[PDB]
Amino acid sequence: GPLGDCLRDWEDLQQDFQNIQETHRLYRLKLEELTKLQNNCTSSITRQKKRLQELALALKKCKPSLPAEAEGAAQELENQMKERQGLFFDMEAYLPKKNGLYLSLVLGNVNVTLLSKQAKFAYKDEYEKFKLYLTIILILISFTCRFLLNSRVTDAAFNFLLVWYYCTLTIRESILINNGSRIKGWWVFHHYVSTFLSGVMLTWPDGLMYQKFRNQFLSFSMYQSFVQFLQYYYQSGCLYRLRALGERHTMDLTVEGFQSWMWRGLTFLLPFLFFGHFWQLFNALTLFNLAQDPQCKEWQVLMCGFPFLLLFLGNFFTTLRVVHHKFH
Amino acid sequence: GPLGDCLRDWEDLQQDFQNIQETHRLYRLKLEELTKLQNNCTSSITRQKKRLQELALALKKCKPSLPAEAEGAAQELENQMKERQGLFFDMEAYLPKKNGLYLSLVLGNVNVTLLSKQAKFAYKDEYEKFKLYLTIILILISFTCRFLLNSRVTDAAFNFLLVWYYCTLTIRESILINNGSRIKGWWVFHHYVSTFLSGVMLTWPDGLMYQKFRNQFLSFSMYQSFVQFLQYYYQSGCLYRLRALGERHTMDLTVEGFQSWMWRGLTFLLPFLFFGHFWQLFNALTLFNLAQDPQCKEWQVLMCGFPFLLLFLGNFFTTLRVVHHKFH
Numbered sequence: 271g272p273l274g275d276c277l278r279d280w281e282d283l284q285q286d287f288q289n290i291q292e293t294h295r296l297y298r299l300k301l302e303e304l305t306k307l308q309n310n311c312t313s314s315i316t317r318q319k320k321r322l323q324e325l326a327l328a329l330k331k332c333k334p335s336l337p338a339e340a341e342g343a344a345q346e347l348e349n350q351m352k353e354r355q356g357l358f359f360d361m362e363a364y365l366p367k368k369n370g371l372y373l374s375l376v377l378g379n380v381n382v383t384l385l386s387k388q389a390k391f392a393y394k395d396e397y398e399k400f401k402l403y404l405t406i407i408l409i410l411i412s413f414t415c416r417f418l419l420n421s422r423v424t425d426a427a428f429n430f431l432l433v434w435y436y437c438t439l440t441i442r443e444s445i446l447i448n449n450g451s452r453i454k455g456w457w458v459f460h461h462y463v464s465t466f467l468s469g470v471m472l473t474w475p476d477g478l479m480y481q482k483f484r485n486q487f488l489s490f491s492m493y494q495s496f497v498q499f500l501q502y503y504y505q506s507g508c509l510y511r512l513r514a515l516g517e518r519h520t521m522d523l524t525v526e527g528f529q530s531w532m533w534r535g536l537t538f539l540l541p542f543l544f545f546g547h548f549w550q551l552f553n554a555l556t557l558f559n560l561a562q563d564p565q566c567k568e569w570q571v572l573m574c575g576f577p578f579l580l581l582f583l584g585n586f587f588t589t590l591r592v593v594h595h596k597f598h
Numbered sequence: 599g600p601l602g603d604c605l606r607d608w609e610d611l612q613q614d615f616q617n618i619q620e621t622h623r624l625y626r627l628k629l630e631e632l633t634k635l636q637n638n639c640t641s642s643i644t645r646q647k648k649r650l651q652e653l654a655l656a657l658k659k660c661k662p663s664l665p666a667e668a669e670g671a672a673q674e675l676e677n678q679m680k681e682r683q684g685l686f687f688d689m690e691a692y693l694p695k696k697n698g699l700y701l702s703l704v705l706g707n708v709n710v711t712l713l714s715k716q717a718k719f720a721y722k723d724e725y726e727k728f729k730l731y732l733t734i735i736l737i738l739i740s741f742t743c744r745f746l747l748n749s750r751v752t753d754a755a756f757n758f759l760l761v762w763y764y765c766t767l768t769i770r771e772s773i774l775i776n777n778g779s780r781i782k783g784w785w786v787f788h789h790y791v792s793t794f795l796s797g798v799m800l801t802w803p804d805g806l807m808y809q810k811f812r813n814q815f816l817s818f819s820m821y822q823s824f825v826q827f828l829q830y831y832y833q834s835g836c837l838y839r840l841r842a843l844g845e846r847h848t849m850d851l852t853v854e855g856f857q858s859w860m861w862r863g864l865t866f867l868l869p870f871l872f873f874g875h876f877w878q879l880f881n882a883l884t885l886f887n888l889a890q891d892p893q894c895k896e897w898q899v900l901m902c903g904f905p906f907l908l909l910f911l912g913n914f915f916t917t918l919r920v921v922h923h924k925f926h
Binding site for chain 1 (some may be wrong): 676709800
């Protein structure tokens with residue numbers, strides 16, 4: 271009868287969930303063991319790192335006092351401790367860490383995915399993928415905007431979207447960095463300043479300058495978007511081929527990976543980046559000259575101009591460092 | 599000599615880091631075992647849940663066809679499967695889960711802190727604590743603003759801060775909920791609509807209506823802030839005393855915990871919440887009437903008015919449901 275089905279269901283649930291519950295309890299015990307082991311190991315690593323830093327400082331102090339015959343041995347020793355510290359950091363990267371000074375405000379939670387190099391590589395993949403999708407979204411929006419509407423409201427909607435973009439992306443960069451990579455630091459400031467740019471331009475409504483400006487600004491935005499497209503495609507290709515060959519750890523090789531696709535891609539992208547910085551400079555100059563027009567007193571045009579120059583300088587410096595590294 | 603110190607340092611580093619590296623390797627193996635076990639257990643739980651849902655649907659289908667003599671046994675059975683499903687969900691809460699439909703956009707990462715009820719309770723504690731700090735920050739800002747400056751720019755700064763507040767807090771609510779609690783759903787929409795309110799009011803610069811309005815609006819904001827203060831202090835007290843007695847799992851007891859401090863605190867807070875909803879209604883009415891003033895055509899006053907009424911209705915409904923539950 272229908273009751274017998276329920277009875278057999280009761281039997282199977284009893285047996286299988288008894289197994290499940292016992293397994294779950296043993297899971298709980300194993301997890302407690304794992305977390306105690308992790309805590310002990312992290313403490314040991316911290317203690318070793320402290321002693322290592324002390325010894326390295328002592329070596330640095332003694333080095334000027336060292337004559338050459340001891341200095342050669344000391345330099346070899348410093349090299350091998352440098353490698354040793356690198357190895358220690360590499361292993362520590364397999365163990366959980368503490369949020370640095372920002373997610374503490376934004377999350378205050380543990381996040382590290384120290385489960386596999388596979389997990390990290392995958393995560394970086396969807397990081398870049400989301401970048402490409404949302405960027406093309408902005409590109410379509412920008413094209414449509416410059417085409418159809420003179421509304422301030424459509425500009426406002428686009429601007430909300432842009433600032434939300436950049437905040438999301440700073441969270442990405444934060445998680446990525448505490449999970450470990452070579453961010454160089456000087457890139458997150460770019461996103462922060464771009465955010466402030468967008469906020470202030472969200473302010474300060476219509477005015478003859480505003481209409482004179484919006485078209486050029488939006489064209490720059492579209493060009494920058496397509497540049498980020500090129501960035502993605504190059505980075506995607508080079509990281510994939512690197513993973514195919516050796517590791518593709520995180521975006522950095524100190525060597526053109528394919529050395530033919532990599533070098534050619536870099537040398538084809540560089541004119542685009544130079545063009546982007548150049549047209550940003552042109553826009554900055556236009557705004558600067560316009561700021562002296564006496565027909566209107568705008569407390570926003572100059573506060574918009576200053577970040578443009580700051581960001582142009584930062585980009586030029588980053589590109590120059592990149593090419594200097596590439597040459598030698 | 600100084601060299602001998604380095605040699606003994608080499609010896610100690612060799613020994614202790616050999617121990618460390620062996621332990622770290624055994625950690626890696628144990629972690630692999632743990633994650634494989636977690637995957638298998640989660641799969642088993644999912645399969646059991648699927649079979650349980652199927653059986654429950656079958657029982658629901660058969661129930662109308664069931665006569666009373668079988669229906670009593672069937673109802674008892676449904677009760678015990680309801681408890682069984684609850685227990686299964688409770689255990690599943692100890693195991694990692696998948697981000698729901700939002701962090702997938704915002705993070706796309708695993709986050710659950712299923713390490714202890716201690717960890718969850720602590721996290722909720724700093725959640726509330728951050729709330730109180732940042733709220734009093736806004737309170738001071740608001741007082742200063744209504745006091746000194748008629749600048750639109752100070753209003754803009756306050757508004758940036760407010761929207762950043764609310765976005766941070768929606769991230770809090772998201773992590774909290776996928777970590778497990780009774781959010782009731784209808785609260786996050788409150789934060790979203792408040793965010794849109796603040797964005798639009800960030801737009802639409804000066805105008806006779808703007809100056810006529812800002813003072814009343816900011817006063818409402820200050821009152822709402824102090825209300826959130828009272829909210830915090832009550833929730834803090836009741837959750838702490840609940841943790842002292844039984845568990846203080848997450849903010850919910852279906853019973854006034856102290857039943858003297860809890861009931862009195864609720865009945866003292868309720869007038870404040872009623873006052874807040876009431877003054878929000880007064881502000882909404884003022885804006886609605888002003889929207890008919892023909893001296894200026896503002897495409898923003900009405901789009902600001904509609905969320906006020908929506909939010910007032912939502913708050914009134916939530917409070918009414920709360921009091922209905924409390925009465926019986």
